[PDB]
Design a protein around this ligand. Sequence first.
Ligand SMILES: Nc1ncnc2c1ncn2[C@@H]1O[C@H](COP(=O)(O)OP(=O)(O)O)[C@@H](O)[C@H]1O
Length: 234
Amino acid sequence: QEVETYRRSKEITVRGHNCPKPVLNFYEANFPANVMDVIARQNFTEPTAIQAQGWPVALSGLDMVGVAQTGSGKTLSYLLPAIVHINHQPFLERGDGPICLVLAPTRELAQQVQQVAAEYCRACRLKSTCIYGGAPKGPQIRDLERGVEICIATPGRLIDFLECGKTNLRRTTYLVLDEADRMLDMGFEPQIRKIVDQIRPDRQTLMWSATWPKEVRQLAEDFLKDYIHINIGA
Ligand SMILES: Nc1ncnc2c1ncn2[C@@H]1O[C@H](COP(=O)(O)OP(=O)(O)O)[C@@H](O)[C@H]1O
């Protein structure tokens, strides 16, 4: 396995049934033209180790957990397959909720992901929005009502909105839990549960974490299906 040479090099450990081979370069991912336009402008030389192994897993439709240090490039690891997903699901109709739901523990990390996502949404003509607590409800409710394919959210504000019927998850087929361990450290487990229970069963779900403790591992087993576990580090 040329694979095992590459994984071993990049300190990639994979666990679970039938993980696809890692993609050795950007071109092999076969992301659509508009996304490539935006990737070329970032002057990356190469895929990061989790993009390498993570992308093909995500693009295959499989559930997974990606464990890597802050800075290993996981945002793109779930975002970019999200775009492909959206391209393969029907067109967004008046009043449809989001197709892709990215949950994040804090306002700041929610906004970071919106920032990364902005350029690709614009190149791909997708609409997205950052939902977070503390800030004016008005603009956020506007965005959700005009319709977004992508909704990046912190749990509390999302709940409030669902309960008020200002959006809904009956189209959410691609679920992301960024910074899951932090999300659990800050005590959001009941809230994340209350959220997912409203998500139709055929969802692909992807968790991302810098660490792999008991609490997170248990969340994975309750929420994921036959998941792949990717580790990055010695
Ligand atoms: N393929 C790549 N090559 C080089 N840098 C990248 C690549 N993908 C992402 N980056 C950059 O690496 C940094 C870390 O990305 P990020 O998604 O924040 O990682 P994490 O979420 O693991 O902390 C960002 O500044 C991002 O622009």
